[PDB]
Design a protein around this ligand. Sequence first.
Ligand SMILES: O=C([O-])CC(=O)C(=O)O
Ligand SMILES: [Cl-]
Ligand SMILES: [Mn+2]
Ligand SMILES: [Zn+2]
Length: 452
Amino acid sequence: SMFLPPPECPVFEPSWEEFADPFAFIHKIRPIAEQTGICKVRPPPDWQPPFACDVDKLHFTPRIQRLNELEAQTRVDYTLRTFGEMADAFKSDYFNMPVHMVPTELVEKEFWRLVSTIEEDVTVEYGADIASKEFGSGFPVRDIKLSPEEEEYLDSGWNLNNMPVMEQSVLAHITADICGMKLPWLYVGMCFSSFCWHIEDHWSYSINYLHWGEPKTWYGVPGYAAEQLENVMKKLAPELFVSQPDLLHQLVTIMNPNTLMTHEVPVYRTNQCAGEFVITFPRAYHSGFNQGFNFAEAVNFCTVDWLPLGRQCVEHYRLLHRYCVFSHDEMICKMASKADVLDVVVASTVQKDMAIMIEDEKALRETVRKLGVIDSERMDFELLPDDERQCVKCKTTCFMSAISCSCKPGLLVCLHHVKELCSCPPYKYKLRYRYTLDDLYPMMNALKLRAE
Ligand SMILES: O=C([O-])CC(=O)C(=O)O
Ligand SMILES: [Cl-]
Ligand SMILES: [Mn+2]
Ligand SMILES: [Zn+2]
């Protein structure tokens, strides 16, 4: 009746031994957690990274949020003190109760009531921003003299600043600018402030740490049910699925998990409390809302497990004409070019993705040759700004190769869309390529030698 809470997601309590290596741990729990999309991780009792900041010197500009189910939202001044004051007063006035006396079950039930009720027009605010000088990480960073306890946590794998640049991580090696994706984001929550249903760019993992405050309530869907969920959403809110002009225009929405459950989409929930992690797995849809004033920090990451999904994601973006954050192939080749310093399991996994890449590229080049494209010239795609190497048709970021024509200077298509460049005959076209097939096989060989 009204709201039936989804079943709880898995909760893990690793020993210090298990916890010592986050990537080994994530790999370990993967068979369980990828069935539920999200999971919660409680660190050992004494793993307690110190949080310290001046609530008066940290400033941010809040986003305003209307709370209407199925309404389109875009994904995209307070001090921490004055936001907290606003947040606490809002919640206490809303329920006419002290804040720690409002039950989490009640806040959840009320959230789904208010987003579905037309006559209510509750609006709330929240902070979402990457770490900057005006507002930095909640974890200790090297810089100001740190206490020994802060020094304990400087190099932790679970310190979310480190997570991207570890050796079992793959986003580490990207030299391209992907700041929105490799740097942690900070989130200052208040009662009912929410994150709409979404998956991460390039189907990456994410990991979210609640530094302090009241809980964050999550709903998650396993990766295998992603298209099921999108089909439900497409039927109920087709506006969200119209083509978008860029990455800064992704449309997202609030939707009751019971609606998904009614359509046989599996959904799991959890209340993430202060000091706990939530991990989301590749292509795992998630959404949720904050129970009260709180402070979270999150970052994307990519393991070796993710590599073939990353390749699939970019193919999916092509089919949808969605812009890429980076070139997957460019990342693969960057890693190949550094094969000698790669971790060995990483090298082994990159090698396998590269073999697919090369075999696909071979077939694509054979096809465009048969279309009458004869002329060719090497081109260092990685030097071009992204907006100068997107396929005219499908918007993919080109790297392995593209087609150009003197008739349309500066315009490019990927090898899937040779017909979409211009009206000139194909003998006027050039194949622009980063590597010959003969360049590529030795690069893959280096990875093989490293992997042994
Ligand atoms: O998607 C996540 O990691 C959760 C999120 O944005 C938030 O805490 O507002
Ligand atoms: Cl409403
Ligand atoms: Mn997310
Ligand atoms: Zn294309």
